[PDB]
Amino acid sequence: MQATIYDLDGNTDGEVDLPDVFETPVRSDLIGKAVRAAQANRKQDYGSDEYAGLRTPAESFGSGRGQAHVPKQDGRARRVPQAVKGRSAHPPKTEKDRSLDLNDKERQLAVRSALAATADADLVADRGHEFDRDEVPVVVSDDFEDLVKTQEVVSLLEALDVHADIDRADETKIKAGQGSARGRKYRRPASILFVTSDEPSTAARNLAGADVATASEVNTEDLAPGGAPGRLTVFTESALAEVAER
Amino acid sequence: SKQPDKQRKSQRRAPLHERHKQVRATLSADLREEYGQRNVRVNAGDTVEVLRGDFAGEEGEVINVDLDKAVIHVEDVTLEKTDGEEVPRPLDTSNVRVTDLDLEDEKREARLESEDDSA
Amino acid sequence: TSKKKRQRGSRTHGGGSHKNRRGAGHRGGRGDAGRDKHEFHNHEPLGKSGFKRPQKVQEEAATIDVREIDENVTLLAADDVAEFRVDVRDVVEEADDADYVKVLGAGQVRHELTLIADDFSEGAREKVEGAGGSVELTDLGEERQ
Amino acid sequence: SKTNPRLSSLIADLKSAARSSGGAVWGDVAERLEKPRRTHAEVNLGRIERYAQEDETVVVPGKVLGSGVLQKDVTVAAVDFSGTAETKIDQVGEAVSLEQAIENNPEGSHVRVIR
RNA sequence: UAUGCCAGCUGGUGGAUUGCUCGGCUCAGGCGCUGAUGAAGGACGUGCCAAGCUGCGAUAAGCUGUGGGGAGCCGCACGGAGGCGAAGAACCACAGAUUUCCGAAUGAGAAUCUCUAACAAUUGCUUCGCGCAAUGAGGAACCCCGAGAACUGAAACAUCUCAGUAUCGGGAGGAACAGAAAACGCAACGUGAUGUCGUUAGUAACCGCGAGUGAACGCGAUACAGCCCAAACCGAAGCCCUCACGGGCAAUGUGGUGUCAGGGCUACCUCUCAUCAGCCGACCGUCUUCACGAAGUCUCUUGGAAUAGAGCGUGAUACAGGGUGACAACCCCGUACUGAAGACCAGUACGCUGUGCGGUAGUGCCAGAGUAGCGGGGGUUGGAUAUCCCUCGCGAAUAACGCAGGCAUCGACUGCGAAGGCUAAACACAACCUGAGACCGAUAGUGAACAAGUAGUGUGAACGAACGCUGCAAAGUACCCUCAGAAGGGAGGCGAAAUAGAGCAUGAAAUCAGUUGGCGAUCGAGCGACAGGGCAUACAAGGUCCCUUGACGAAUGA
RNA sequence: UGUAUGGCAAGUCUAACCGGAGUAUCCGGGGAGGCACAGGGAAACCGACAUGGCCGCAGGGCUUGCCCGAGGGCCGCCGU
Ligand SMILES: [Cl-]
Ligand SMILES: [Cl-]
Ligand SMILES: [Cl-]
Ligand SMILES: [Mg+2]
Ligand SMILES: [Mg+2]
Ligand SMILES: [Mg+2]
Ligand SMILES: [Mg+2]
Ligand SMILES: [Mg+2]
Ligand SMILES: [Mg+2]
Ligand SMILES: [Mg+2]
Ligand SMILES: [Mg+2]
Ligand SMILES: [Mg+2]
Ligand SMILES: [Mg+2]
Ligand SMILES: [Mg+2]
Ligand SMILES: [Mg+2]
Ligand code: NA
Ligand code: NA
Ligand code: NA
Ligand code: NA
Ligand code: NA
Ligand code: NA
Ligand code: NA
Ligand code: NA
Ligand code: NA
Ligand code: NA
Ligand code: NA
Ligand code: NA
Ligand code: NA
Ligand code: NA
Ligand code: NA
Ligand code: NA
Ligand code: NA
Ligand code: NA
Ligand code: NA
Ligand SMILES: [Sr+2]
Ligand SMILES: [Sr+2]
Ligand SMILES: [Sr+2]
Ligand SMILES: [Sr+2]
Ligand SMILES: [Sr+2]
Ligand SMILES: [Sr+2]
Ligand SMILES: [Sr+2]
Ligand SMILES: [Sr+2]
Ligand SMILES: [Sr+2]
Ligand SMILES: [Sr+2]
Ligand SMILES: [Sr+2]
Ligand SMILES: [Sr+2]
Ligand SMILES: [Sr+2]
Ligand SMILES: [Sr+2]
Ligand SMILES: [Sr+2]
Ligand SMILES: [Sr+2]
């Protein structure tokens, strides 16, 4: 198919052929499997102290004093799982493999499928993104990589009728639960992904919910956050070309 | 650190010289233009305007700056005890704005006027 | 919902009487215990059988059936096209760490092939010669005497 | 329960064609595709060459693999073909998707089931 | 209706629950020795008033210097009194001063004290004098060398297994150990120091051939680095102490040469950039710390308080996180960007000085003995005839010789020179620093969020808890009455709230006081389920229900 | 050792590790090696049906009982 290139003013500047990978059939089950694997592989090993509750010479008195055969020390119960201050019976273990394996072919197919989901305007709108376009992904010229100011990227996205997505992501949610105590108090909607070629866009990175990536290493996660296909993306002309052989 | 526990810890357990940054208030439009700073370390000679509490809108001289409790006393910003004595209501400098400065110290004036440093 | 997830409330977790899931007595001893007494069933019988030759006096031959060569001749355009001629040593995988290359005779030979290998089976010759072809033994293959 | 959306659609399409049109094959193929993956067909070319004939579409209720030789000018229809299978079939005949076979022949006529 | 039963209401009791996190738990990166120059640890001191903790040491919460920092300060800990600070304090970094007693504890003794100069004790050097030095003890685990169980498994048990594990003795370091082939043995026209990781593989091997046990060569990686003696031939040409003088060592050999690309000697060719000794000496990177650092504290409404809702506006290489009277990019700290310092890499790399690599011919000059090897007895190992080691006995050759290649002997072949020595880097741990989290969230998580190894128990070894939360601000309740009264109570005052009033957010159940509804002093006990009646009921969140008659009308049926 | 789902398929998967980077995630390398592709025999050693016959389910075909009949079933035959 054909993809319309846009200049830094938001006007048309020709068109190049939209590569073959954008016609790869959308496969949400494989995309979801790849995101599930990526999210799991960054999780840290944890577990309670191997000796927690075992640091006592507590012994059971056995039969005779009208008491249950529970290990006691200084007339206080210890060690056993049913005892207060006792060991955890089946606790989280550090030795546990918390990683998920994925075949390269299966993962590569998911990258290709997620890239393709980016080319369907209805799937992108189904995902939740707010925009006023027909043609998707938004293809921009390589001169996008030379932009320095964030405010300049706002102007271009306003000219491209695609800024409404950043307004959607300009609302932080204060999560329910104790994640707050561990550093995970806030979260926000995922907005526009910016795929460049040389270096990730320093100019676009701070935009609400925006994620910046490069064509050589853009993965399933930035292409489909949370496993949900169809992210409103914007490619650089050279990025569109390089993302073809992935 | 991004961790909340460590963040609050470093603020409460901060040494005395590092507690100066805990008693900083925003400068007025004129003072921001004059010295090239957005905020300043509140001194016991400065005039301040209350922007947030129950005393919002009131002006007054800064009578005391407690570094340990990271709080300030401003003139007439008081509470009336049961006996009748008017005791100061401590204010967080974050809810306050500096209108006039005490430049009796040569070092503070020089620090405010230098483009490479800040006060 | 799994089997494991439906166990809360069952008391016994599928173990029958609560007197069952105790120690090793429920298993009849630890590991392979009683492989000749109470649990002799479906166990390989006791004893020694045969001998082993030292591993460095052992030869490992790389094998290939005529059917594998014959089905892939048109696809093997990177090898000699005579009046087809193919050096089998260049076709078989893991032929570096192997002692010798042997062509076996399973399947059909629909083409006229001139195969070069270290060893051939009686049936590998019969099928190649029987369809207008030749069999060439290597200088390493000159051990058959 | 199938996890692939494309297979779920193919089964639904094979069912629609079995009921609407006069076909008995597509509903029979749908029933095998609803069965576990291990029971699905994993057929090599040497079997299509042995049992198929020209002008009779070969229907594989699974996947076609590339071992062996195929000389016959046959049209093979399957859920998927391996890279080598599709290449070797297109050289002498035509490798068609089961999805196209339902559109080209909704009545399921002149067709041979191979597994 | 008393005693009383059930449910509820008001108030307690209790401290669950919800919310909160100054603590834990785990992972990751960095870094890593201390001590006779007396450590670590402990004791006793030390403040204006000082019990605990922390700090400090008779100069005692401290003294000096440089730098940073800055108008405040006098630790935890908000008191009273008083004091210090522009003579630039506090505070932080680096450096230094002081640094009681016991403690390896070292003059001698001793429950932290005492008695009349002290490296006690063991050593090396030696001016033979404690003159100059060394050792001792500590450290989270890691590391190396020795000693070495049992429960257990085998459904008993003895070999075997648990296991060279637990535990014990000795010892080093920041890492240890190992290490430049008498190797390997995909047998080769092949590999080429050593660790380690992946694999080889639960393969070979062991084993009441039961249960169990269990490598290696090779390969892919990580990191890479190779050398010094003894002897031959030289023979004092040498080394140590001292400023010197001078002394000490050394023919029982200091020093030169040399070290399997064998070397030496003799005769020659050429040449060095090898090696060894020594000088200089980083970039980068990583870890930590620091400087700088954009933009609203505008309108209205609610509120005790606006970070809320509605409205308007701004920054962003900064929309990580925290603070702030409620949810904050723009109020404060920070965060991006840029820059700075220290530490580690590393006294390494590079560079340099000096030295001199190598080759030919001849020469039986040299080349590590209780060894190699054999035997008796044991341990250990996968090591089977073929592991490694200990012990008793025996015991060789001399490169023209010897060892190895998984049974012995002999021959051939291939590999390699033991019985002397050193060696960077890649790997282990987590004390210490920093970072991180689908970990726990105060009966959890450490025993320990609190006085925590605290209170407390035991002669002792040892054992060992519980206790988090007023409020936006102490505004932490003046005055009056009562009372034996700083008690308590009443009234009163503050605050949005005192049912937030001090172990003070919330405030469950068990349960207690008072009280409401129902039952109740002639009557029977799994306490109820389902039906149906009495009596009782503010709203809200349910709105149906009764009777005449009529319609429909299964089975059944006058 | 089964099973369900998914990728690839006469193949399939990388391990340690290396480079990149948005730096534990992730992108690209890495096939060492494992399992499968032939078995039988203690070993020496030898080395197989890309189909020859008959039934016949599903499905297809026809002129509507008659044909073709994957899979499956019964035999042949082949390796040791
Ligand atoms: Cl064998
Ligand atoms: Cl097949
Ligand atoms: Cl080798
Ligand atoms: Mg516990
Ligand atoms: Mg909750
Ligand atoms: Mg300034
Ligand atoms: Mg003494
Ligand atoms: Mg036993
Ligand atoms: Mg037995
Ligand atoms: Mg063992
Ligand atoms: Mg070996
Ligand atoms: Mg020398
Ligand atoms: Mg043993
Ligand atoms: Mg606790
Ligand atoms: Mg309370
Ligand atoms: Na304990
Ligand atoms: Na009891
Ligand atoms: Na793990
Ligand atoms: Na049980
Ligand atoms: Na090899
Ligand atoms: Na009574
Ligand atoms: Na360190
Ligand atoms: Na005290
Ligand atoms: Na000191
Ligand atoms: Na000494
Ligand atoms: Na002496
Ligand atoms: Na037993
Ligand atoms: Na017994
Ligand atoms: Na045994
Ligand atoms: Na504020
Ligand atoms: Na012996
Ligand atoms: Na050898
Ligand atoms: Na508690
Ligand atoms: Na391979
Ligand atoms: Sr008894
Ligand atoms: Sr303080
Ligand atoms: Sr304080
Ligand atoms: Sr069961
Ligand atoms: Sr037990
Ligand atoms: Sr038996
Ligand atoms: Sr291979
Ligand atoms: Sr090397
Ligand atoms: Sr020697
Ligand atoms: Sr032999
Ligand atoms: Sr409690
Ligand atoms: Sr006792
Ligand atoms: Sr009152
Ligand atoms: Sr009765
Ligand atoms: Sr009727
Ligand atoms: Sr692969």
UniProtKB/Swiss-Prot annotation, chain A:
Domain of life (superkingdom): Archaea
InterPro entries with a match to the protein in the record: Ribosomal_uL4, Ribosomal_uL4_dom_sf, Ribosomal_uL4_euk/arc_CS, Ribosomal_uL4_euk/arch, Ribosomall_uL4-arc
Gene3D superfamilies given in the database record: 3.40.1370.10
Bias-annotated ranges (Basic and acidic residues): 92-103
Region described as Disordered: spans on this chain: 37-103
GO biological process: one example: translation
MF annotations from Gene Ontology: rRNA binding; structural constituent of ribosome
Gene Ontology CC, one term: ribonucleoprotein complex
UniProt-listed Pfam families: Ribosomal_L4 (PF00573)
Keywords for this protein: Ribonucleoprotein, Ribosomal protein, RNA-binding, rRNA-binding
Family: Belongs to the universal ribosomal protein uL4 family.
Subunit structure: Part of the 50S ribosomal subunit. Interacts weakly with proteins L18e, L24 and L37e. Has been cross-linked to L18e.
Chain's role: One of the primary rRNA binding proteins, this protein initially binds near the 5'-end of the 23S rRNA. It is important during the early stages of 50S assembly. Makes multiple contacts with different domains of the 23S rRNA in the assembled 50S subunit.
Name of the protein described by the UniProt record: Large ribosomal subunit protein uL4
Source organism (scientific name): Haloarcula marismortui (strain ATCC 43049 / DSM 3752 / JCM 8966 / VKM B-1809)
Source taxonomy: Archaea, Methanobacteriati, Methanobacteriota, Stenosarchaea group, Halobacteria
Curated annotation (Swiss-Prot), chain B:
PROSITE patterns cross-referenced by the UniProt entry: RIBOSOMAL_L24
Sequence ranges of Basic residues compositional bias: 9-23
Gene3D superfamilies assigned to the protein according to its UniProt record, in alphabetical order: 2.30.30.30
Region Disordered, residue ranges: 1-25
Record-level GO BP terms: translation
Molecular function, one GO term: rRNA binding
Domain of life: Archaea
GO CC aspect terms: large ribosomal subunit
Pfam families, per database record: KOW (PF00467), Ribosomal_L26 (PF16906)
SMART domains tied to this protein: KOW (SM00739)
Keywords: Ribonucleoprotein, Ribosomal protein, RNA-binding, rRNA-binding
InterPro entries according to UniProt: KOW (IPR005824), Rib_uL2_dom2 (IPR014722), Ribosomal_uL24_CS (IPR005825), Ribosomal_uL24_euk/arc (IPR005756), Ribosomal_uL24_KOW (IPR041988), Translation_prot_SH3-like_sf (IPR008991)
Complex formation: Part of the 50S ribosomal subunit. Interacts weakly with protein L4.
Functional description taken from the UniProt entry: One of two assembly initiator proteins, it binds directly to the 5'-end of the 23S rRNA, where it nucleates assembly of the 50S subunit. Stabilizes the tertiary rRNA structure within the 23S rRNA domain (domain I) to which it binds. Located at the polypeptide exit tunnel on the outside of the subunit.
Family note: Belongs to the universal ribosomal protein uL24 family.
Matching HAMAP family: Ribosomal_uL24_A
Name used for this protein in its record: Large ribosomal subunit protein uL24
Organism for this UniProt entry: Haloarcula marismortui (strain ATCC 43049 / DSM 3752 / JCM 8966 / VKM B-1809) (Halobacterium marismortui)
From Swiss-Prot, chain C:
Gene Ontology biological process terms from the UniProt entry: translation
Annotated stretches, region: Disordered: 1-58
A molecular function (GO) term: rRNA binding
SUPFAM superfamilies noted in UniProt: Ribosomal proteins L15p and L18e
Keyword field contains Ribonucleoprotein: yes
Keyword annotations from UniProtKB, A to Z: Ribonucleoprotein, Ribosomal protein, RNA-binding, rRNA-binding
Biased composition (Basic residues): 1-28
Keyword check for RNA-binding: yes
GO terms for cellular component: cytosolic large ribosomal subunit
Gene3D superfamilies attached to this UniProt entry: 3.100.10.10, 4.10.990.10
Sequence ranges of Basic and acidic residues compositional bias: 29-46
Primary role: Binds to the 23S rRNA.
Assembly: Part of the 50S ribosomal subunit. Interacts weakly with proteins L18e and L32e.
Similarity comment: Belongs to the universal ribosomal protein uL15 family.
Protein's UniProt name: Large ribosomal subunit protein uL15
Organism of this sequence: Haloarcula marismortui (strain ATCC 43049 / DSM 3752 / JCM 8966 / VKM B-1809)
Name of the gene this protein is made from: rpl15
Swiss-Prot record, chain D:
Gene Ontology MF annotations: rRNA binding; structural constituent of ribosome
Gene Ontology BP terms: translation
Superkingdom assignment: Archaea
InterPro entries associated with the record: Ribosomal_eL18, Ribosomal_eL18/eL18-A/B/_CS, Ribosomal_eL18_arc, Ribosomal_uL15/eL18, Ribosomal_uL15/eL18_sf, Ribosomal_uL15_CS
Keywords: Ribonucleoprotein, Ribosomal protein, RNA-binding, rRNA-binding
The UniProt record lists the keyword RNA-binding: yes
GO cellular component entries: cytosolic large ribosomal subunit
Known function: Stabilizes the tertiary rRNA structure within the 23S rRNA domain (domain II) to which it binds.
HAMAP family: Ribosomal_eL18 (MF_00329)
PANTHER family (alphabetical): 60S RIBOSOMAL PROTEIN L18, LARGE RIBOSOMAL SUBUNIT PROTEIN EL18
Known partners and oligomeric status: Part of the 50S ribosomal subunit. Interacts weakly with proteins L4 and L15. Has been cross-linked to L4.
Descriptive protein name: Large ribosomal subunit protein eL18
Originating species: Haloarcula marismortui (strain ATCC 43049 / DSM 3752 / JCM 8966 / VKM B-1809)
Gene name per UniProt: rpl18e
